[PDB]
Ligand binder design. Sequence first.
Ligand SMILES: [Zn+2]
Ligand SMILES: [Zn+2]
Ligand SMILES: [Zn+2]
Lengths: 53, 53, 53
Amino acid sequence: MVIATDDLEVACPKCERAGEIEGTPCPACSGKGVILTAQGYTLLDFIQKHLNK
Amino acid sequence: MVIATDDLEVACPKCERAGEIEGTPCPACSGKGVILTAQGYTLLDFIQKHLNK
Amino acid sequence: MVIATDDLEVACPKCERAGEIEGTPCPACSGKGVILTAQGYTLLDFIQKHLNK
Ligand SMILES: [Zn+2]
Ligand SMILES: [Zn+2]
Ligand SMILES: [Zn+2]
């Protein structure tokens, strides 16, 4: 394990572990516990072609 | 982001942005916008076990 | 390809190529042909949010 979720998902401004903000889904994430980044999107968008596309 | 789609998907010989060739899907890709490589297959084939397998 | 399945999945104690043990799947992995690791889980668990979650 040389890579962590820090290079794919980053903790949101408030809902990085709560899953919600102010009672509603955070503008960046919605109950995920972080947010997607350039790498995460590449590793997700690419897999979205062989998994969901 | 320290990694790009270049280490997973490479532009096809002709259909790297068109998604098709001569009205027909490229022998390597079929409207994807690139092609899969050894790394892409490992990162896709491995996820195909926890997503599609 | 600069990465292999060795940084995501490793051969199990017995069912790394058999896919089964004593007539039953390995306690650590099922007829998969290996086992999940910390990296594989991160690359799978993260994709499990954009693919299965
Ligand atoms: Zn958020
Ligand atoms: Zn092609
Ligand atoms: Zn096993």
